User: Fold Beta-Galactosidase from Escherichia coli.
Amino acid sequence: PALTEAKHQQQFFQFRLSGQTIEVTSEYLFRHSDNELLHWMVALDGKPLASGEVPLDVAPQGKQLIELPELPQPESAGQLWLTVRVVQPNATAWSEAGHISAWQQWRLAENLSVTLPAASHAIPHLTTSEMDFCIELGNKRWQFNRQSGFLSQMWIGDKKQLLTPLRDQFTRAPLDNDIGVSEATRIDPNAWVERWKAAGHYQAEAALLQCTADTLADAVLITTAHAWQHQGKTLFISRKTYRIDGSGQMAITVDVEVASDTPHPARIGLNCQLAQVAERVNWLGLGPQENYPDRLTAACFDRWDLPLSDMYTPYVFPSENGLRCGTRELNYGPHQWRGDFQFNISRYSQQQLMETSHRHLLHAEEGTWLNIDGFHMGIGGDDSWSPSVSAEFQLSAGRYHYQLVWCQK
Amino acid sequence: AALLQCTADTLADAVLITTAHAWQHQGKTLFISRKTYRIDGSGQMAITVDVEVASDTPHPARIGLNCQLAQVAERVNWLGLGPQENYPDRLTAACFDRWDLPLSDMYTPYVFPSENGLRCGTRELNYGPHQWRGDFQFNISRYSQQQLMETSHRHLLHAEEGTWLNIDGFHMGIGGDDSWSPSVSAEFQLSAGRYHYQLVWCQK
Assistant:
């Protein structure tokens, strides 16, 4: 996937946007834009509202101004984005016709949603037990284990939906960069992995601090608090609220605290093993390829739909992969998630990935593994034998917050 | 501001209030503020704020709350960055400790008046019988921002009725590379789009 970032960063054309004008600059020293078409287009949350085509005429090292026709001013809520692409109409000795040589995108506007969810004719029905809490609403049912404090299962009809409970996750299956040259025999104490390990990140134990349920006028409310500890030290604290309304949506809210003296964690999110397994993956966010915090300029914000298989990156030596950031809506099966996060989805648990040395040895697991991150550390790469992730990409804030919405169709 | 919603609910151990407002202007919605107030049997009020900012509006100077307290005290005591006025892009010299000063010291008599006296990275703030807790920045004086904003010389300010208090979850940098162009660096602009903060208020 990296190749793409490269291609993008190396493009020969550079754009500037000013009002309705696009400024184009040529990084060619000798040629003229003689096989160049500029396609542009506007969309609202993925919905295309206008497209255009304009032939480029730029001298090496020159500028070209591009005047935009009056732009649409949708009422509807959402993000308005502009995207340009450069195309090579005619083939070349090294390229096919219709080749894309450059692109760039901008966010034009935003229409914040001020609407309210219409009333529901009913409200979830809570049900205590010793072991748990039961929330029911129609065919839908959710259960939270009282000992663990997690959402243990959920049904649609008589169908269980998870093979694994929904939980906080703070680590990742180490990247090559996370490892560097650390070896079992000869460990490198500064490697991220090494530190994480030593800190017990990989093996901290969660502890329920609190778990409560409450009935509100329009929904049911659950609250939890856990602590991950290791050898007496508390690494993290996770406080959540789950709120299920009469519309059948579950809103999740997460607030985490990280000990300042622990190594910044690879990530901050949740995960679970879904019982279902589908064909496609559809999302509204950065795509379509794998992208990370410190490697995503080449990605575009749009609506993507791919086959599950494509959501996996077959790095010969396996590790965390396939992430997509800046996601607002994710759809898989009957499920839908909403918010602002990054995620990955495949048939391999991080543990598997982490424990397997060659790609050829992985075997798909039972359902679908899903990781939803509120935040994720950068990947680095300045070199692969020292820590190369820049500070701006480390999860060093100490406190993190994120929210999410889960539903079915 | 426009009330979008306001509700109350009784929980087993506390009372819960929730609100949602929208600030608009000429049909455009600039911000959205969603809160929860939760008062328990211990008499503490926990506040939770989540804001959304239109990506196409100019980054706001700050994100917080304010009010005019009826009381007026002598000292100010806090646990955070001090003791002098400090801002996001101007605070390396400040220290994290417990500070106690006289109200007067919480004001910066810039000849030409403006926002001032802020202290960041605060975890606990005490004034009178009150106490606030969380992670914020604040300022406290006898002058409303409006006054400051409307007065050209320091000598013309007059203390207002009680004590004005501004508690910020976030605050923009002040800049200074030059004073005749925008000099605040990007790292100091409130450009995230979404902000969250929490607070705790009580009395002694």
